[PDB]
Ligand binder design. Structure first.
Ligand SMILES: Nc1ncnc2c1ncn2[C@@H]1O[C@H](COS(=O)(=O)NC(=O)CCCC[C@@H]2SC[C@@H]3NC(=O)N[C@@H]32)[C@@H](O)[C@@H]1F
Length: 266
């Protein structure tokens, strides 16, 4: 609404650079753009033209042609979200492990905003693959895309974004009770958490998988999983495997899902 605009000051690119680029940090470049079609598309394009995008950060105040998984979209209004993409060199890591990079990103986003909530409402955590949920609503969405030797990780985090503006199943920090969320502080914490999780992923650190399981809303829940191609499978999510795939219990039979949309059931 018009009133939420007063809760949406611009990002401070100068300050973010000061905090996030320098000794002790792996981020090599940070830019804030007023507007773009898709931050993911932009970093993919840079890589396609020969740019080294490892440790490169692109943040957009507004995104007009946002991309979701499986060809879906991502909606946004100006300054209502933290909208960013980062580049990650992955060629040094076995391809079977790349799926965990996306899971690590969701964990980073969750950890960056979790303390901002006074009372953690029911169902606050990670829905497989890496939706960030709070009170059943989708607080953030992550998209990982390949451009050898890189992966581009994209984060869309609803800070003051109203559900009526983007999606009926959406939520935001503001709609979770955070009266005056500071995107500058949140973006800084997010990128610091993200660096740590990427390093963990790159070194196959056991704590990454352990920390993910600890925050998983999906593991242990009855789910309907919509597979690519339109088929549904119903069962109980039991675990995540070493490729980041979802292990389903279907009446005693194990079904491993590499990609799909999860609906938590009663
Ligand atoms: N702002 C929003 N908040 C919550 N849910 C939203 C939303 N905008 C759209 N949605 C809903 O979520 C669906 C898409 O969800 S999804 O298939 O799991 N995909 C994702 O969650 C990944 C989204 C990644 C968006 C980031 S923002 C910066 C980066 N660049 C880019 O183009 N994409 C990534 C849409 O079909 C539906 F509209």
């Amino acid at each position: 609404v018009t009133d939420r605009d007063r809760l949406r000051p611009p990002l401070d690119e100068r300050s973010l650079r000061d905090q996030l680029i320098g000794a002790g940090s792996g981020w090599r470049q940070l830019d804030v753009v007023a507007q773009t079609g898709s931050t993911n598309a932009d970093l993919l394009a840079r890589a396609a033209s020969g740019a080294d995008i490892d440790g490169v950060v692109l943040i957009a105040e507004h995104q007009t042609a946002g991309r979701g998984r499986h060809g879906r979209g991502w909606a946004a209004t100006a300054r209502a979200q933290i909208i960013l993409s980062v580049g990650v060199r992955v060629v040094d890591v076995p391809v079977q492990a790349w799926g965990w990079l996306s899971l690590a990103a969701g964990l980073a986003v969750l950890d960056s905003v979790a303390p901002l909530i006074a009372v953690p409402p029911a169902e606050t955590g990670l829905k497989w693959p890496n939706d960030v949920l709070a009170r059943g609503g989708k607080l953030a969405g992550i998209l990982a895309e390949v451009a050898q030797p890189f992966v581009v990780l994209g984060v869309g985090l609803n800070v003051t974004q109203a559900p009526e503006e983007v999606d009926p199943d959406a939520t935001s920090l503001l709609d979770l009770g955070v009266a005056a969320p500071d995107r500058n502080r949140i973006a800084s914490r997010l990128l610091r958490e993200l660096e740590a999780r990427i390093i963990q992923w790159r070194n196959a650190n056991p704590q990454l998988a352990a920390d993910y399981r600890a925050r998983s809303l999906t593991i242990g829940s009855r789910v309907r999983v919509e597979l690519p191609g339109g088929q549904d499978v119903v069962g109980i999510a039991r675990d995540i495997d070493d490729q980041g795939r979802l292990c389903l219990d279907v009446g005693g039979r194990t079904v491993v899902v590499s990609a799909g949309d999860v609906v938590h059931l009663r």
